[PDB]
Design a protein around this nucleic acid. Sequence first.
RNA 1: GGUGGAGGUCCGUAGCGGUCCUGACGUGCGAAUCGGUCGUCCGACCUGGGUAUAGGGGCGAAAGACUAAUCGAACCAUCU
RNA 2: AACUUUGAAGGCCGAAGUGGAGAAGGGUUCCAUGUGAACAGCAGUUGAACAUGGGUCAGUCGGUCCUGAGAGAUGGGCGAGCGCCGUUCCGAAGGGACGGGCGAUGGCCUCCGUUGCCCUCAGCCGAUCGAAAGGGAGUCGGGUUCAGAUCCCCGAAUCCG
RNA 3: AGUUCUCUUUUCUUUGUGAAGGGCAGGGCGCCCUGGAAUGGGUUCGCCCCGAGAGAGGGGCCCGUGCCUUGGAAAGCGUCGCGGUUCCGGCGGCGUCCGGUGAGCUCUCGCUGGCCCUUGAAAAUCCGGGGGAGAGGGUGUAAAUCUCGCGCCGGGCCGUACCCAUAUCCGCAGCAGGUCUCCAAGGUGAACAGCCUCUGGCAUGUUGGAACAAUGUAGGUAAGGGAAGUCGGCAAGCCGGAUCCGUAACUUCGGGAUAAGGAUUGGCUCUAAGGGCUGGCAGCCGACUUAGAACUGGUGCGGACCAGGGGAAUCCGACUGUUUAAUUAAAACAAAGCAUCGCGAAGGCCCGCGGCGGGUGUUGACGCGAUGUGAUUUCUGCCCAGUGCUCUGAAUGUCAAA
RNA 4: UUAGUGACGCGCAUGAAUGGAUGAACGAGAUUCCCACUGUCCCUACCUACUAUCCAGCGAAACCACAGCCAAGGGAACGGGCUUGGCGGAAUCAGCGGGGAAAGAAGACCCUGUUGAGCUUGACUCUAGUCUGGCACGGUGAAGAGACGUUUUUUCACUGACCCGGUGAGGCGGGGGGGCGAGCCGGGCUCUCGCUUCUGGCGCCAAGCGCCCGGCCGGCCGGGCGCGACCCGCUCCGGGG
RNA 5: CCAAGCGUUCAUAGCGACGUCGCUUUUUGAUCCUUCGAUGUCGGCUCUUCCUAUCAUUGUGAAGCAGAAUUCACCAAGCGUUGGAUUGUUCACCCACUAAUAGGGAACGUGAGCUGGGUUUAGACCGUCGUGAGACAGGUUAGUUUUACCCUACUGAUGAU
Lengths: 91, 248
Amino acid sequence: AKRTKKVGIVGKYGTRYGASLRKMVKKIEISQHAKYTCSFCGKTKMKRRAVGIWHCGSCMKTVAGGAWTYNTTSAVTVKSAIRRLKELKDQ
Amino acid sequence: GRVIRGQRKGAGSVFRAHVKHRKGAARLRAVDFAERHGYIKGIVKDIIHDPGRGAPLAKVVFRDPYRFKKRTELFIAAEGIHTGQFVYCGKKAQLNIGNVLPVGTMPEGTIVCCLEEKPGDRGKLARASGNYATVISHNPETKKTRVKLPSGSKKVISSANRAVVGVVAGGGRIDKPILKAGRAYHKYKAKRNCWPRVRGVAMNPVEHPFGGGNHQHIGKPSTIRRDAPAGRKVGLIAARRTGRLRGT
RNA sequence: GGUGGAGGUCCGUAGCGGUCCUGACGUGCGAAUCGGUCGUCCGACCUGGGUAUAGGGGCGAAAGACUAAUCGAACCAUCU
RNA sequence: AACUUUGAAGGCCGAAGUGGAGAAGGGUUCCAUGUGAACAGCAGUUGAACAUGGGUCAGUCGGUCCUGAGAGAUGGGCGAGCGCCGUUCCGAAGGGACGGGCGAUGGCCUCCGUUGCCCUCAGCCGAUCGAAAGGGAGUCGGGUUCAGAUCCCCGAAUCCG
RNA sequence: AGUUCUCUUUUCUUUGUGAAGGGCAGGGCGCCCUGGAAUGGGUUCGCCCCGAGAGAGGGGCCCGUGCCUUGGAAAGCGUCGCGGUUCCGGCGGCGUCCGGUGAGCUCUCGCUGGCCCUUGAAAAUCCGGGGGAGAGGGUGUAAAUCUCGCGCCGGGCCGUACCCAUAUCCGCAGCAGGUCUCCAAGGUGAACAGCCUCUGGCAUGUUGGAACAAUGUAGGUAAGGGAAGUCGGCAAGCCGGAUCCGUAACUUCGGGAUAAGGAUUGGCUCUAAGGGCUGGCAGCCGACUUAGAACUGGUGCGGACCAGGGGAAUCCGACUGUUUAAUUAAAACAAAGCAUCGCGAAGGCCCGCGGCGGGUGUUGACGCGAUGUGAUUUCUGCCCAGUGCUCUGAAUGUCAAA
RNA sequence: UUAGUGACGCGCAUGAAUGGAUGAACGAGAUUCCCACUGUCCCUACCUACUAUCCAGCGAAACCACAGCCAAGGGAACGGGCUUGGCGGAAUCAGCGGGGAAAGAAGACCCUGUUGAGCUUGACUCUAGUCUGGCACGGUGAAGAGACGUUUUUUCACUGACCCGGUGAGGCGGGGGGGCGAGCCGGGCUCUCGCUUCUGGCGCCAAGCGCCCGGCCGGCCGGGCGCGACCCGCUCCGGGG
RNA sequence: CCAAGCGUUCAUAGCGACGUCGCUUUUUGAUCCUUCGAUGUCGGCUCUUCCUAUCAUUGUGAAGCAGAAUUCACCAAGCGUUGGAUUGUUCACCCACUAAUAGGGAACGUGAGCUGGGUUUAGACCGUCGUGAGACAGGUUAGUUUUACCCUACUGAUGAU
Ligand SMILES: [Mg+2]
Ligand SMILES: [Mg+2]
Ligand SMILES: [Mg+2]
Ligand SMILES: [Mg+2]
Ligand SMILES: [Mg+2]
Ligand SMILES: [Mg+2]
Ligand SMILES: [Mg+2]
Ligand SMILES: [Mg+2]
Ligand SMILES: [Mg+2]
Ligand SMILES: [Mg+2]
Ligand SMILES: [Mg+2]
Ligand SMILES: [Mg+2]
Ligand SMILES: [Mg+2]
Ligand SMILES: [Mg+2]
Ligand SMILES: [Mg+2]
Ligand SMILES: [Mg+2]
Ligand SMILES: [Mg+2]
Ligand SMILES: [Mg+2]
Ligand SMILES: [Mg+2]
Ligand SMILES: [Mg+2]
Ligand SMILES: [Mg+2]
Ligand SMILES: [Mg+2]
Ligand SMILES: [Mg+2]
Ligand SMILES: [Mg+2]
Ligand SMILES: [Mg+2]
Ligand SMILES: [Mg+2]
Ligand SMILES: [Mg+2]
Ligand SMILES: [Mg+2]
Ligand SMILES: [Mg+2]
Ligand SMILES: [Mg+2]
Ligand SMILES: [Mg+2]
Ligand SMILES: [Mg+2]
Ligand SMILES: [Mg+2]
Ligand SMILES: [Mg+2]
Ligand SMILES: [Mg+2]
Ligand SMILES: [Mg+2]
Ligand SMILES: [Mg+2]
Ligand SMILES: [Mg+2]
Ligand SMILES: [Mg+2]
Ligand SMILES: [Mg+2]
Ligand SMILES: [Mg+2]
Ligand SMILES: [Mg+2]
Ligand SMILES: [Mg+2]
Ligand SMILES: [Mg+2]
Ligand SMILES: [Mg+2]
Ligand SMILES: [Mg+2]
Ligand SMILES: [Mg+2]
Ligand SMILES: [Mg+2]
Ligand SMILES: [Mg+2]
Ligand SMILES: [Mg+2]
Ligand SMILES: [Mg+2]
Ligand SMILES: [Mg+2]
Ligand SMILES: [Mg+2]
Ligand SMILES: [Mg+2]
Ligand SMILES: [Mg+2]
Ligand SMILES: [Mg+2]
Ligand SMILES: [Mg+2]
Ligand SMILES: [Mg+2]
Ligand SMILES: [Mg+2]
Ligand SMILES: [Mg+2]
Ligand SMILES: [Mg+2]
Ligand SMILES: [Mg+2]
Ligand SMILES: [Mg+2]
Ligand SMILES: [Mg+2]
Ligand SMILES: [Mg+2]
Ligand SMILES: [Zn+2]
């Protein structure tokens, strides 16, 4: 059964810290505790070990990722930019 | 009056960095013949949390070109590198995330991290989590490069300075509210004795310029000149302006 | 409807603290203790030993607090 | 003899103890015998008092060794100077070794040791101190005294060299 | 051994086996081989696992502190009975037995998960592997060599008593203070609560006797009223456990909430339901629970103990946290959040008499340093004259030494 | 109802991060009212324990000019003493709190002192630090502008002082040698390169070749050198200066 | 005290101008004589006593005293003079009962009698003021109340000549 209407994971904090801060931290709490599909082995096991450190329990690979998400939008953009500059550099 | 807290921070004592569980200084490779003239290969063995640092660190292993040994380096982990990956350092390394190249060979607009302030210093700029520098331009005649730093300042550096391609991992860390004094207690228990911070107006005049009064007020302007003596230089130090930053 | 068992979460012991009685005592058991009643009790928690900071100095989640019953500048000897 | 000892009753602490053992601190207060001057805020035939004598046994339980936060010499620097800073930093920082070649001495003189020199090889990169709660091989059962016992004796083991 | 007037095949006590070696249970494996799975299956309290190989078969390894065995019955213990100098490790008989059970408590081993802007020592020391420089003998009188089984010798130095705390320590003392730990029984009960008891311990806390006046200190009880007392309900009192029902304003939708408000609760005799093992059934074992019913007492039943009074509002501070050791615990401090300011290292901020000195810094702007405000919500208006801070400067008044 | 709450607002002297307004939850924080409850009270009583009490033993201390009954008087303007009156009778016990302007501590308040100390600043006089100019360390060379071959100054360079960073000071500069390209009439040059990028392997302690030498009987056994691994150089390599 | 007036009339039932004479020390002042090697600083509570300048009650005289109610005066302090809301309050105001709800002193009686609400230390907030440290007969909140066993007095208890 649905146990809360809107707090969800930030129901652990009760009434404290304010609705907007709890609303903000809810987005991060879901993402930083999610299990992502590993791109090396395909199993949904990519889990955060520390801030910025993501580890897959199946293939044992470790990845330098984002603080709360597996990869950041900034890092994804930079990889494409570095890929494009590499082609032009050697044509 | 007595010596103020800011004065006492300089003597070391209870204000020294908490470095008991840190893993070592994060650095590039020391520049040698392989990086000067070609490239050297390495393998990312592990990516580890460093107490007190937001960014993760990568443990990279190289071969020693002169002795039968394995060299373990401790790099700032660029975002997207994984264990078992091969990284390459040197003049002729390819433009890939995690490789170490001189900024002179990088095309304009390259995104780099752990960039040398001076050629050979082994990486000093843009090392915080999520941060990076950019390459603006080169002057092959003067053998120098123009980069943009995470603060936004533009700097002219030698073209021979090395850097790691990509941005530092662990980005977006400051986007999470701490929500708790206790969580800030733990953040700084790994760094140094700087928390919590008592306000100047909350003290007596003996230990602070702003202390004292029947009302908690500064009483004197809080923008303090650049040349004020230690123990007086408190508040907004040499402020060019104050108030809300409205506009660009 | 169940399962699950988070929390600077709540009642409450050990522990840690010390609100009120303006209770006891006030040539005291005690140069600060005693009783009931009370705060908190997974955390910014409690605590042993080691080690560091020394007097216009330290150290202070800040009361001019603490720095060996001494603190709006310790104690000791000297100047005297 | 209200208070000591024995016996018997009636009670209390009520396994977070008023029980059984340690650390720090004490330092003989421990145990036996004697005294009842002084002390133990009454008394005492009693005491942790006084007096006369005893009592602490280890490869295996700790220290001892390691490093921790840290402390601290040398090189160097500073300093009128006692000295101070500094701990890898302005240093010719190794007194070692498989092996090989030249000799010298000895002995179970057969040939091997030891020993001197030369050749060869050599990162550790920091003297030293720092924990009776951290790391750190290996001992247990029974008996035994007034007081000691995983230490003594009996039996059975084990680590290191 | 106790009780035995009556009853009680009763109540109480007690009923071993060390280290090390061997074997075997048990536990664990992210170890191997066959094979190839959707009608997906396996599986936990939860999870979680699989074509990167699931189920199902057959193996391997690690720990085995459990049991057996050597130790080892010779000892220890219980009990009965004999001896001595009788201060003997004295000598004999018998015994040291068979099962069950548990979210029980304590310890431990293991598996699996959660939390971190926290990621939770170093070294001495020991080991395995990769390589193959070398060495060993020429078929024997075998050699180099051996982390295998026996056997031989040694292990020095210092500590070691006792107290460990309402009398061995610190507070001038045998001071109601302070002072770090380990073990931890039965009953009631949710319980390391309180109350009673066993093992162990003690003698009432630096004296006794006799009285039972006032005034005290500490406990109680009071007709009728019910805060009229007092600055103020200070103090005391009321409520209180559990089950069943029921629960508002407001709210940041998490709460408020044990809101508020009711009913019930003992004893006894029953009924039903909830499981395991062996071979839709049969038999044999069992662990406390829940619900319901009758009967029953002078309506007494959470019978002691344990154990929230409640509601409507206003001010302040968001909260948890901290503080004037010894008159102030608070609205003060901190806090997350918010906003400013300096700094790209020959740097910012700071220490230092001193230097190629030192802290931040094992750091690098998502950082470090310096201030203000003080969660969230909503907003943060006008003023650069003053005082500050800051920016430009040979264009340029005053302006030291040289 | 000098209290509380809600309104009003020309507000002595409210007001926007010297933050304004709010608001759930929370509070040993301040305040008002209501239910319940009661000895807070009307208005007190009784009971229990330990005292006090009396006894045996044992046994302090604070304090003390002499002392210790009052009325009035006058008096340093509130007498235990003095004057005038009232009056006065051993030694003691339990209580008590009127007095002793009781004890306690050379008044903290207030003033004075040519006595201080903590703190502040637009006080006076200084001072660490800091910014700034000059002189020295402190050099080499080109230009520009001046002054009379010398000399001042500006710019640009240099390195060798001086500083910084890295490293176990491990391949620096120049030349040679070699490879792919270009292009002029096979050779010379423009000019560039120095052998590693797929995979979570391995990688040292030289192979090979050339030339010498030793011991033993062309054959065995064993050494030395060189190339492999280019040569020459004055700062280890960079960055400043 | 005088008496212009008021009181329909009428100075004096009851009042009383312009003037003037006193008393009191429960108001505030003025002064600075005592106390700064300290006389505990408001209010309440509690408890006794005293004054009279009499509110009530007893006995009376006078009224513009018909009665009732009331007013003025005399002897007079024997006995009374209350319960409450707001406030720390003294003071004040209101509710209610009453014969009446009088006024005062006793070191502005009374803190080794209490309480500690206010004032009046150190913490903290607001406003105004100050550049500031800080200040404010301006608000606010929290803030240790010591000793009797001596002498006397008093209360009771033995006793003494
Ligand atoms: Mg100052
Ligand atoms: Mg303060
Ligand atoms: Mg809690
Ligand atoms: Mg709680
Ligand atoms: Mg008290
Ligand atoms: Mg007393
Ligand atoms: Mg702390
Ligand atoms: Mg200092
Ligand atoms: Mg203060
Ligand atoms: Mg004990
Ligand atoms: Mg003992
Ligand atoms: Mg005695
Ligand atoms: Mg003894
Ligand atoms: Mg030193
Ligand atoms: Mg040592
Ligand atoms: Mg040790
Ligand atoms: Mg032995
Ligand atoms: Mg299987
Ligand atoms: Mg036997
Ligand atoms: Mg091998
Ligand atoms: Mg012992
Ligand atoms: Mg007793
Ligand atoms: Mg006794
Ligand atoms: Mg005692
Ligand atoms: Mg006692
Ligand atoms: Mg009653
Ligand atoms: Mg009644
Ligand atoms: Mg009242
Ligand atoms: Mg009253
Ligand atoms: Mg109360
Ligand atoms: Mg409520
Ligand atoms: Mg309001
Ligand atoms: Mg608070
Ligand atoms: Mg603290
Ligand atoms: Mg205090
Ligand atoms: Mg307190
Ligand atoms: Mg500000
Ligand atoms: Mg301005
Ligand atoms: Mg009221
Ligand atoms: Mg109002
Ligand atoms: Mg504004
Ligand atoms: Mg304001
Ligand atoms: Mg006596
Ligand atoms: Mg006198
Ligand atoms: Mg006389
Ligand atoms: Mg008196
Ligand atoms: Mg006095
Ligand atoms: Mg004085
Ligand atoms: Mg004084
Ligand atoms: Mg004078
Ligand atoms: Mg002075
Ligand atoms: Mg001073
Ligand atoms: Mg001046
Ligand atoms: Mg007339
Ligand atoms: Mg005078
Ligand atoms: Mg005079
Ligand atoms: Mg006096
Ligand atoms: Mg007095
Ligand atoms: Mg009269
Ligand atoms: Mg008075
Ligand atoms: Mg008095
Ligand atoms: Mg008093
Ligand atoms: Mg008060
Ligand atoms: Mg105050
Ligand atoms: Mg102001
Ligand atoms: Zn994976």
